[PDB]
Design a protein around this ligand. Structure first.
Ligand SMILES: [Ca+2]
Ligand code: NA
Length: 259
């Protein structure tokens, strides 16, 4: 049931980090879970610092919300920023100090593919407005895997590319007119890229949309609340049809409605 985004609900806090290491981070579930994982499996990465390698894995939502991890993976190279996703059994993440996306197969703890995103800025060239080296933002939607970035040729405007999830080849690319550094974060729903206006305001908005199917850009005024005033990560999960976000120590989720 696809459609245009028309409403975002209030943020619900599912877990709060207890140390500064989790001031920012990414948490996620797999919209295409494969054995041995399920739709309840949750991953959490606290991303403050310069040697981020620990990925916390929880078999059950109850464990994610109240307990210790059921497994900790140690990535073979340090991860950059909050943009990572899980899709069809693999963590897709950006190597620190690089424009390289890595496919890390979770069950086998193996790197299956690596790809430089052609021309992408990295390490503070085209971050979102809060900084945090957020130059490269992976996304999953109803159609699969994407990457959101910018290039010098695009003059810092958001570029988005569909990715082959097996080998990380770029399949198609679109260029928006939205300055990446001017928005707080972005995500894709049903092939439309949406941006959030502010990472600090309790009265922010989903403020722009770009539809990859029609090429049309629009403004929007949909309310979006940063309850804790520092949102470092905002992604969409197409299986749950919810936003997942990280706001100033807090792992939160938002319900949505589509037309
Ligand atoms: Ca995002
Ligand atoms: Na992402």
């Amino acid at each position: 049931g696809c459609g245009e985004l028309v409403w975002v609900g209030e943020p619900l806090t599912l877990r709060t980090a207890e140390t500064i290491t989790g001031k920012y981070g990414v948490w996620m579930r797999d919209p295409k879970p494969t054995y041995p994982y399920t739709q309840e499996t949750t991953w959490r990465i606290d991303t403050v610092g310069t040697d981020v390698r620990q990925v916390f894995e929880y078999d059950l939502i109850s464990q994610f919300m109240q307990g210790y991890p059921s497994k900790v993976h140690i990535l073979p190279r340090p991860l950059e920023s909050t943009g990572a996703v899980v899709y069809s059994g693999s963590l897709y993440f950006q190597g620190a100090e690089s424009r390289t996306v890595i496919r890390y197969e979770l069950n086998t703890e193996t790197v299956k593919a690596e790809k430089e995103i052609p021309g992408a800025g990295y390490h503070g060239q085209f971050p979102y407005s809060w900084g945090g080296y957020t130059d490269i933002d992976l996304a999953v939607d109803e159609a699969g895997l994407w990457v959101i970035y910018s290039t010098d040729e695009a003059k810092g405007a958001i570029v988005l590319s569909k990715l082959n999830p097996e080998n990380l080849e770029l399949e198609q690319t679109w260029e928006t007119n939205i300055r990446k550094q001017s928005v707080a974060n972005a995500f894709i729903i049903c092939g439309t890229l949406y941006t959030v206006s502010s990472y600090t305001s309790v009265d922010a908005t989903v403020n722009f949309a770009y539809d990859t199917g029609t090429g049309i850009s629009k403004t929007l005024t949909i309310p979006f609340k940063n309850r804790y005033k520092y949102s470092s990560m905002i992604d969409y999960n197409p299986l749950e049809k919810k936003l997942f976000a990280w706001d100033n120590l807090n792992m939160v989720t938002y319900d949505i409605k589509l037309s």
